[PDB]
Scaffold this active site. Structure first.
Site, PDB file in Angstrom:
ATOM      1  N   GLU A 177     -77.231 -34.711  14.069  1.00  0.00           N
ATOM      2  CA  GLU A 177     -76.162 -33.921  13.470  1.00  0.00           C
ATOM      3  C   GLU A 177     -76.442 -32.421  13.605  1.00  0.00           C
ATOM      4  O   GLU A 177     -75.526 -31.624  13.790  1.00  0.00           O
ATOM      5  CB  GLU A 177     -76.001 -34.284  11.990  1.00  0.00           C
ATOM      6  CG  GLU A 177     -74.875 -33.539  11.285  1.00  0.00           C
ATOM      7  CD  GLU A 177     -73.498 -34.016  11.705  1.00  0.00           C
ATOM      8  OE1 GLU A 177     -73.269 -34.183  12.922  1.00  0.00           O
ATOM      9  OE2 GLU A 177     -72.638 -34.216  10.818  1.00  0.00           O
ATOM     10  N   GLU A 178     -77.712 -32.044  13.509  1.00  0.00           N
ATOM     11  CA  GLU A 178     -78.096 -30.645  13.632  1.00  0.00           C
ATOM     12  C   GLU A 178     -79.417 -30.502  14.369  1.00  0.00           C
ATOM     13  O   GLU A 178     -80.049 -31.492  14.734  1.00  0.00           O
ATOM     14  CB  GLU A 178     -78.222 -29.987  12.250  1.00  0.00           C
ATOM     15  CG  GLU A 178     -79.275 -30.616  11.347  1.00  0.00           C
ATOM     16  CD  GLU A 178     -78.743 -31.818  10.585  1.00  0.00           C
ATOM     17  OE1 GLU A 178     -79.423 -32.866  10.581  1.00  0.00           O
ATOM     18  OE2 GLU A 178     -77.648 -31.708   9.984  1.00  0.00           O
ATOM     19  N   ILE A 193     -78.174 -23.095   7.900  1.00  0.00           N
ATOM     20  CA  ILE A 193     -79.542 -23.309   7.453  1.00  0.00           C
ATOM     21  C   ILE A 193     -79.735 -24.772   7.033  1.00  0.00           C
ATOM     22  O   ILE A 193     -78.959 -25.307   6.231  1.00  0.00           O
ATOM     23  CB  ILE A 193     -79.867 -22.381   6.247  1.00  0.00           C
ATOM     24  CG1 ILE A 193     -79.927 -20.923   6.712  1.00  0.00           C
ATOM     25  CG2 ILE A 193     -81.180 -22.792   5.590  1.00  0.00           C
ATOM     26  CD1 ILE A 193     -80.207 -19.922   5.584  1.00  0.00           C
ATOM     27  N   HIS A 194     -80.765 -25.417   7.577  1.00  0.00           N
ATOM     28  CA  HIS A 194     -81.039 -26.808   7.247  1.00  0.00           C
ATOM     29  C   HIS A 194     -82.462 -27.002   6.719  1.00  0.00           C
ATOM     30  O   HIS A 194     -83.386 -26.301   7.126  1.00  0.00           O
ATOM     31  CB  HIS A 194     -80.821 -27.697   8.465  1.00  0.00           C
ATOM     32  CG  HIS A 194     -80.830 -29.158   8.144  1.00  0.00           C
ATOM     33  ND1 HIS A 194     -79.783 -29.783   7.497  1.00  0.00           N
ATOM     34  CD2 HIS A 194     -81.763 -30.116   8.361  1.00  0.00           C
ATOM     35  CE1 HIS A 194     -80.069 -31.063   7.335  1.00  0.00           C
ATOM     36  NE2 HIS A 194     -81.265 -31.290   7.850  1.00  0.00           N
ATOM     37  N   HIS A 219       0.859  -1.181   0.000  1.00  0.00           N
ATOM     38  CA  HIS A 219       0.000   0.000   0.000  1.00  0.00           C
ATOM     39  C   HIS A 219       0.902   1.240   0.000  1.00  0.00           C
ATOM     40  O   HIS A 219       0.645   2.202  -0.725  1.00  0.00           O
ATOM     41  CB  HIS A 219      -0.906   0.021   1.244  1.00  0.00           C
ATOM     42  CG  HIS A 219      -1.547   1.352   1.508  1.00  0.00           C
ATOM     43  ND1 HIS A 219      -2.842   1.645   1.139  1.00  0.00           N
ATOM     44  CD2 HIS A 219      -1.058   2.481   2.078  1.00  0.00           C
ATOM     45  CE1 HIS A 219      -3.125   2.895   1.468  1.00  0.00           C
ATOM     46  NE2 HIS A 219      -2.058   3.424   2.039  1.00  0.00           N
ATOM     47  N   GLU A 220       1.955   1.219   0.813  1.00  0.00           N
ATOM     48  CA  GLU A 220       2.875   2.353   0.880  1.00  0.00           C
ATOM     49  C   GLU A 220       3.701   2.410  -0.403  1.00  0.00           C
ATOM     50  O   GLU A 220       4.049   3.495  -0.887  1.00  0.00           O
ATOM     51  CB  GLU A 220       3.804   2.223   2.097  1.00  0.00           C
ATOM     52  CG  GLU A 220       3.074   2.253   3.440  1.00  0.00           C
ATOM     53  CD  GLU A 220       2.305   3.542   3.642  1.00  0.00           C
ATOM     54  OE1 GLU A 220       2.826   4.609   3.249  1.00  0.00           O
ATOM     55  OE2 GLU A 220       1.186   3.504   4.197  1.00  0.00           O
ATOM     56  N   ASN A 276     -59.023  -5.793 -21.088  1.00  0.00           N
ATOM     57  CA  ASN A 276     -57.760  -5.606 -21.779  1.00  0.00           C
ATOM     58  C   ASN A 276     -58.015  -4.786 -23.042  1.00  0.00           C
ATOM     59  O   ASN A 276     -59.019  -4.982 -23.727  1.00  0.00           O
ATOM     60  CB  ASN A 276     -57.173  -6.974 -22.145  1.00  0.00           C
ATOM     61  CG  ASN A 276     -55.740  -6.888 -22.622  1.00  0.00           C
ATOM     62  OD1 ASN A 276     -55.400  -6.050 -23.460  1.00  0.00           O
ATOM     63  ND2 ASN A 276     -54.890  -7.765 -22.100  1.00  0.00           N
ATOM     64  N   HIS A 332       2.086   4.456  -2.978  1.00  0.00           N
ATOM     65  CA  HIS A 332       2.282   5.891  -2.797  1.00  0.00           C
ATOM     66  C   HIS A 332       3.629   6.235  -3.400  1.00  0.00           C
ATOM     67  O   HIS A 332       3.771   7.237  -4.095  1.00  0.00           O
ATOM     68  CB  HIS A 332       2.288   6.260  -1.318  1.00  0.00           C
ATOM     69  CG  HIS A 332       0.924   6.340  -0.719  1.00  0.00           C
ATOM     70  ND1 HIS A 332      -0.099   7.060  -1.298  1.00  0.00           N
ATOM     71  CD2 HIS A 332       0.412   5.802   0.412  1.00  0.00           C
ATOM     72  CE1 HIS A 332      -1.181   6.961  -0.550  1.00  0.00           C
ATOM     73  NE2 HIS A 332      -0.897   6.204   0.495  1.00  0.00           N
ATOM     74  N   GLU A 342      -5.049   9.395  -2.283  1.00  0.00           N
ATOM     75  CA  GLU A 342      -5.130   8.432  -1.184  1.00  0.00           C
ATOM     76  C   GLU A 342      -6.271   7.442  -1.424  1.00  0.00           C
ATOM     77  O   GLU A 342      -6.143   6.247  -1.135  1.00  0.00           O
ATOM     78  CB  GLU A 342      -5.355   9.151   0.155  1.00  0.00           C
ATOM     79  CG  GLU A 342      -4.237  10.115   0.541  1.00  0.00           C
ATOM     80  CD  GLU A 342      -4.563  10.948   1.777  1.00  0.00           C
ATOM     81  OE1 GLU A 342      -4.661  10.375   2.890  1.00  0.00           O
ATOM     82  OE2 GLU A 342      -4.726  12.180   1.630  1.00  0.00           O
ATOM     83  N   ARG A 376      -9.722  -4.164   5.050  1.00  0.00           N
ATOM     84  CA  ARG A 376     -10.913  -3.387   5.366  1.00  0.00           C
ATOM     85  C   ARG A 376     -11.727  -3.138   4.099  1.00  0.00           C
ATOM     86  O   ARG A 376     -11.184  -3.141   2.993  1.00  0.00           O
ATOM     87  CB  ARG A 376     -10.500  -2.051   5.961  1.00  0.00           C
ATOM     88  CG  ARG A 376      -9.813  -1.174   4.936  1.00  0.00           C
ATOM     89  CD  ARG A 376      -8.839  -0.215   5.571  1.00  0.00           C
ATOM     90  NE  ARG A 376      -9.458   0.508   6.668  1.00  0.00           N
ATOM     91  CZ  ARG A 376      -8.893   1.534   7.285  1.00  0.00           C
ATOM     92  NH1 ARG A 376      -7.692   1.957   6.904  1.00  0.00           N
ATOM     93  NH2 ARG A 376      -9.529   2.129   8.283  1.00  0.00           N
TER      94      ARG A 376
HETATM   95 ZN   LIG Z   1      -2.311   5.737   2.071  1.00  0.00          ZN
END
Ligand SMILES: [Zn+2]
Ligand SMILES: [Zn+2]
EC number: 3.4.24.69
Length: 1287
Positions: free
Chosen positions: A1185-1186, A1236-1237, A229-230, A1021, A233, A267, A369
């Site tokens: 039943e009902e 209803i029956h 990295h340096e 449509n 530069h 940088e 990073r």
């Molecule tokens: Zn730097």
């Protein structure tokens, strides 16, 4: 190839590869330093860098050099000869690692061959002057104890050990007379202060450090990458391209803003990744132009160089040949040098975008990073880089034979503990901001923890300047990219031209500027009574000398008492956490509270679809109180109203320049140079659009996305604090027990931490997705539109400019001043769609963007919702909504348009959204309730068409109207061509699904069709290919407009617009989402209410109604009467017939006023028998039943069930509900459902079948079948009188 020399610190000085050097900043005075040539033109001096630093500053003090670094001090580093040798061997190893791959070897080769020009700005064009501190450095030849004999040498790089701060590596250039040769094309001797053992530490936000927050987290750096990295530069400095330009400067006007040094574009280029995107295209070109200009000077010098006064033995041809290759200049057959645009472009891009830390890391498989702007952590010491078991030339720390190659495990702190050691905080210095309240309590916050918000001055305003357009004028795009693959395979990248010999005349002019450094206070005190993110996070911690704490929802109490810790989780979570239990119940309590923690953290996946928000982390506001007091009230509601903006700690002032005017140059009689001028102005116009977008992205990334990054980090901390607090309480409660009791307590702390940590990781993923979504949202809705406004303004100004130009030149354009007349209209017609991938190639950012764009809800450009007795737009595009006095609004999001002139809504749409996709692409959705026709007004109902929603701009647009039982969608292109599609419901049905009942409309438009959907179902449509451009962003007027009856009205709800065609699947989903409710509905679709008179309807027996039989306690089922008049257009069955029922609540005697009936509620189904209120009962002892239901006065009998549970067995939208009889609320004994029956009756006179109001167990199993049977006789609907329905 690159050769790395070998040597030991104690090897004898030979005046060749091992010398006694006189460093540039020594000024020809003081002592010399033993230096070793690690490679041609590169020197290693294993001693502390002391130039410009005070000796005592090498000790940790109350001060710091850099406000954004956790500075480690150690005056003993390199204080012995053995330590020096270790430094040398380590550098030798890093250099070997660097050259182990083609890419790094090429970086080294470029550096070695990138010799500084012999001279600088002060030197005459015709000469080479080696007698300057940036070109020549001296070595002492003479015997020890006398500077009697010196010898000069050319050099490219000199690497020293560290300065006062071990972890602050830095590359330094040489300035002379306030100028830097390395910044003006010449290049100059470069220096570096470097430390291989104390490396930086970082952790990914969008990731998790080995999925462990209880263990060490984050990764440590590979010193070889730190070095490269340096070296980048250095590379820039050697080629003279380390220029200065408009820097990114942090805003520091507020106490929550991070203070740091100005950041130069060079940088950010060096780091790579997304950082280059923070440098606007304007500044990119400015830097490009400056470097190019620098090279023009150098090339002119090579054409004029004649002699080297300072050193007669310098072979001029050798250097001219070398500099020609260094700068990639071209040479003709004579020897004239010139700049070759293509070769320069490639060299420039290679140096600024090819060699980057990011590109190198990817290539060497080293983790680093994510961004320049990432929180810096405490450094760690690497035990022994010289131990191949821990670090190798080939793989660094990520050694495959140790299974540490995958996922960068070798750099993982939680995994490779045998490779590093933590550092003594006593030797660390960190710049803090002490936030004091005007009383007083003070909290320290590391400057690193604050919000980095770039100041407006950081961005260029070059877009505002005028541009001269000519037949020549061409586009100017700089691709912040460079194929690392080609660079690695480039054949003529690395020179094959002889490196000149380094020996030269001794330097006698030591004139040089030496930097002077000094620490500043490590603590800055500020005053504020604000309780924002910093205080909120602080309230969640506790002192080290405390072991007994209790959680609290009170932020103020937490700040006041050291034994009180703030918690943003539920009230129940907090009470349980502070609960004390007997030993025997401890293990159970642990399982419980731990489980509750995961549940609370998991709430981060909350959905809010009804508000058109897929993801929402409800507790973010309570956790940090960041932005506009997000801790007060309900965070979700506040977010629905303002969105992403409420989380920002600060709203940046954007730089959005008025694009400069274009000055077209005329070419009288030149039919070509004129045509070109016009075309070039068009292409240039696009460059302005792209550039403006780049300017927006740069500001977004450095002023907005940075704030959201801090919020993400803040949440990770808050979550960890909560887990830390719970862990502390568990430990305390457990340690209160005796050793005997503990032995019988089954607990595993590791697993506790494991489960808590898991809950945290899950929450972090949700929070990261939420925040990234918020960030993209701000960009798209709060930033891009403001740029578009200006760009459209610019377009118009340019349009009248080009037309008028084609007019003044009409002659010289003869029969074409029309062909290009339109050529301009059609060009400035299509705007440039914003595409983030154009401004950056960062995988994380692109994915963020693509994700956002894949969410259909982000296509909403208008969303009218109710809030504080008013209707506002919640799309986030800020449409202005004026609701006039005649409109009725309620909290159910329903609004009524009446015949009154003031019953109107005016909406002014955001004119800056890509709506006109050049082929019509948008949708409109809403719910509507249209009242029934008046029987005595059927002619006008079927004849009078009236508009309800009109959106017209320049006699073009769309409209929604109604004609009786038909709803119409109408489009009108710019030419005035009209097309329609409509939906008409039947008005002769015995029972209509639509008349006076709420239903869902959705109209979609695309290049070909116009479709109308009703309750998710496609109904109509229409081919709309002929229709041309339709202007849809005009004002939207909601008002009944036409020849209507004074009684006419319309109810509407959830009106929204999408700038895309919704799919049938999207519509169905929207229909389902907006149909959902916790309560039941009535026949009309409104909420079902208690204490409200209702007639009953049966979905399985549509034309039937219930009536108390005259001589018995039963409900006979009769046939509905019908429309009696003679109209041929209408028919229907009466709805206001039969007994008038009323639903009464069962629990809590809150009286019988009125309220909302919810699903699962226990009720009493009553009805009015004249002046009395009766009830619906079920005889308890029937075996069939009902059985017929029992209707009688209100009373409590042991023989009759009187309690009903209202249900909703249907999973799909319906206004039907079911009525269940259970033995009692608690039991799971279901008696049956009301229905209803049919019974057979054979008496002395009549023989026939008759239906009765009953209860049947048969329905119990039928309601489970799928799809839900809407025809079942147990499906009922409640009908109250409604002005929208008269009979
Ligand atoms: Zn730097
Ligand atoms: Zn930062």
């Amino acid at each position: 190839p690159v050769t790395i020399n070998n040597f030991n610190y104690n090897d004898p000085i030979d005046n060749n590869n091992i010398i006694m050097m006189e460093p540039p900043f020594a000024r020809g005075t003081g002592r010399y330093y033993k230096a070793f040539k690690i490679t041609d033109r590169i020197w290693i001096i294993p001693e502390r860098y002391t130039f410009g630093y005070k000796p005592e500053d090498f000790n940790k003090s109350s001060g710091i050099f850099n406000r954004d670094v956790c500075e480690y001090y150690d005056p003993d580093y390199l204080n012995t000869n053995d330590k020096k040798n270790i430094f040398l061997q380590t550098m030798i190893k890093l250099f070997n690692r660097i050259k182990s791959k083609p890419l790094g070897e090429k970086l080294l080769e470029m550096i070695i061959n990138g010799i500084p020009y012999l001279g600088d700005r002060r030197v005459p064009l015709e000469e080479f002057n080696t007698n300057i501190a940036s070109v020549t450095v001296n070595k002492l030849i003479s015997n020890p104890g006398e500077v009697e004999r010196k010898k000069g040498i050319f050099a490219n790089l000199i690497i020293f050990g560290p300065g006062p701060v071990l972890n602050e590596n830095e590359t330094i250039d040489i300035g002379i007379q306030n100028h830097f040769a390395s910044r003006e094309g010449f290049g100059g001797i470069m220096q570096m202060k470097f430390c291989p053992e104390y490396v930086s530490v970082f952790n990914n936000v969008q990731e998790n450090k080995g999925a462990s927050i209880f263990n060490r987290r984050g990764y440590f750096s590979d010193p070889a990458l730190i070095l490269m990295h340096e070296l980048i530069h250095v590379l820039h400095g050697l080629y003279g391209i380390k220029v200065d330009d408009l820097p990114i400067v942090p805003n520091e006007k507020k106490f929550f803003m991070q203070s740091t040094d100005a950041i130069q574009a060079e940088e950010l280029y060096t780091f790579g990744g997304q950082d280059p995107s923070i440098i606007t295209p304007s500044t990119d070109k400015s830097i490009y132009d400056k470097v190019l200009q620098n090279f023009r000077g150098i090339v002119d010098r090579l054409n004029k160089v004649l002699v080297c006064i300072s050193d007669p033995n310098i072979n001029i041809n050798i250097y001219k040949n070398k500099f020609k290759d260094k700068y990639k200049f071209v040479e003709d057959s004579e020897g004239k040098y010139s700049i070759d645009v293509e070769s320069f472009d490639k060299l420039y891009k290679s140096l600024m975008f090819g060699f980057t830390e990011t590109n190198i890391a990817e290539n060497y498989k080293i983790k680093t990073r994510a961004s320049y702007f990432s929180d810096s952590l405490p450094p760690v010491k690497i035990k022994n880089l010289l131990d191949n078991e821990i670090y190798t030339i080939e793989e660094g720390f990520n050694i495959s034979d140790k299974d540490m190659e995958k996922e960068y495990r070798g750099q993982n702190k939680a995994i490779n503990k045998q490779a590093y050691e933590e550092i003594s905080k006593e030797h660390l210095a960190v710049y803090k901001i002490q936030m004091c309240k005007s009383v007083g309590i003070c909290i320290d916050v590391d400057n690193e923890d604050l919000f980095f918000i770039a100041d407006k001055n950081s961005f260029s305003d070059d877009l505002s300047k005028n541009e001269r357009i000519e037949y020549n004028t061409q586009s100017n795009y700089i691709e912040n990219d460079f194929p690392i693959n080609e660079l690695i395979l480039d054949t003529d990248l690395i020179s094959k031209i002889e490196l000149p010999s380094e020996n030269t005349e001794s330097l006698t002019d030591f004139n040089v500027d030496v930097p002077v450094y000094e620490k500043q206070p490590a603590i800055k005190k500020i005053f504020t009574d604000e309780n924002t993110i910093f205080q909120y996070l602080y309230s969640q911690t506790f002192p080290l000398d405390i072991r007994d704490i209790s959680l609290t929802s009170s932020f103020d109490d937490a700040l006041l008492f050291s034994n009180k810790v703030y918690s943003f989780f539920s009230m129940d979570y907090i009470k349980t956490a502070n609960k004390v239990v007997e030993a025997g119940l401890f293990a159970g309590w642990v399982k419980q509270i731990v489980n509750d923690f995961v549940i609370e953290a998991n709430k981060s996946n909350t959905m809010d679809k009804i508000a058109d928000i897929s993801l929402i982390v409800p507790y973010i506001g309570l956790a940090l109180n960041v932005g506009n007091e997000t801790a007060k009230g309900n965070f979700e509601n506040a977010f629905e109203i303002a969105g992403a903006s409420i989380l920002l700690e600060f709203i940046p002032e954007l730089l959005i320049p008025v694009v400069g005017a274009f000055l077209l140059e005329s070419y009288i009689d030149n039919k070509n140079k004129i045509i070109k001028t016009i075309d070039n102005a068009l292409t240039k116009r696009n460059e302005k659009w792209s550039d403006m977008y780049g300017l927006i992205v740069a500001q977004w990334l450095s002023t907005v996305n940075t704030q959201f990054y801090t919020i993400k980090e803040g949440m990770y901390k808050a979550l960890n604090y909560q887990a830390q607090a719970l862990e502390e309480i568990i430990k305390y409660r457990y340690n209160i027990y005796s050793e005997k009791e503990k032995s019988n307590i089954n607990i595993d702390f590791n697993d506790i931490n494991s489960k808590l940590n898991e809950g945290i990781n899950q929450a972090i993923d949700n929070i990261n997705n939420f925040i990234n979504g918020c960030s993209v949202s701000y960009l798209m809705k709060k930033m891009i539109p403001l740029a578009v406004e200006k760009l459209l303004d610019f377009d118009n100004t340019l349009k009248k400019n080009l037309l008028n130009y084609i007019d003044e030149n009409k002659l010289y354009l003869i029969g074409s001043a029309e062909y290009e007349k339109s050529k301009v209209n059609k060009y400035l017609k299509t705007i440039m769609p914003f595409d983030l991938s154009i401004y950056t190639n960062d995988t994380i950012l692109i994915e963020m963007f693509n994700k956002y764009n894949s969410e259909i809800l982000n296509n909403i450009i208008l969303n009218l919702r109710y809030k504080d007795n008013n209707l506002i737009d919640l799309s986030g595009y800020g449409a202005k909504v004026e609701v006039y006095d005649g409109v009725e609004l309620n909290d159910k999001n329903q609004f009524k348009l009446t015949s009154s002139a003031n019953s109107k809504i005016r909406v002014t749409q955001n004119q800056n959204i890509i709506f006109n996709s050049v082929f019509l692409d948008f949708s409109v959705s809403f719910w509507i309730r249209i009242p029934k026709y008046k029987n005595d007004g059927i002619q006008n109902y079927i004849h009078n068409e009236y508009t309800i929603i009109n959106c017209m701009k320049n006699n073009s647009g769309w409209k929604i109207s109604i004609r009786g039982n038909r709803i119409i969608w109408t489009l009108i292109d710019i030419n005035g061509k009209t097309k329609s599609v409509f939906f008409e419901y039947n008005i002769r049905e015995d029972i209509s699904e639509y008349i006076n009942r709420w239903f869902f409309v959705t109209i979609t438009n695309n290049l070909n069709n116009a479709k109308i959907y009703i309750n998710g179902k496609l109904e109509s449509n229409t081919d709309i290919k002929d229709i041309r451009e339709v202007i849809a962003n005009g004002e939207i007027i909601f008002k009944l407009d036409g020849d209507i009856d004074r009684t006419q009205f319309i109810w509407m709800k959830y009106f929204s617009i999408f700038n895309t065609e919704l799919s049938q699947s999207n519509i169905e989903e929207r229909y389902k989402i907006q149909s959902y409710s916790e309560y039941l509905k009535d026949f009309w679709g409104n909420p079902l209410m208690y204490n409200k008179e209702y007639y009953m309807f049966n979905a399985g027996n549509k034309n039937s109604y219930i009536k108390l039989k005259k001589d018995s306690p039963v409900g006979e089922i009769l046939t509905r009467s019908k429309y009696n008049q003679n109209s041929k257009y209408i028919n229907y069955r009466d709805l206001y017939i039969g007994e008038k029922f009323i639903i009464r609540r069962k629990s809590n005697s809150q009286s019988i006023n009125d309220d909302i009936v919810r699903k699962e509620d226990y009720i009493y189904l009553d009805f009015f028998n004249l002046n009395q209120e009766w009830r619906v009962y079920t005889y308890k002892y029937f075996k069939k039943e009902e059985e017929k239901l029992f209707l009688a006065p209100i009373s409590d009998s042991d023989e009759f069930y009187n309690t009903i549970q209202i249900k909703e067995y249907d999973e799909q939208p319906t206004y039907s509900c079911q009525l269940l009889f259970k033995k009692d609320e608690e039991s799971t004994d279901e008696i049956g459902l009301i229905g209803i029956h049919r019974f057979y009756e054979s008496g002395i006179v009549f023989e026939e079948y008759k239906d009765y109001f009953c209860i049947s167990k048969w329905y119990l199993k039928e309601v489970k079948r799928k799809p839900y049977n809407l025809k079942l006789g147990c499906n009922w609907q409640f009908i109250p009188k409604d002005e929208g329905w008269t009979e």
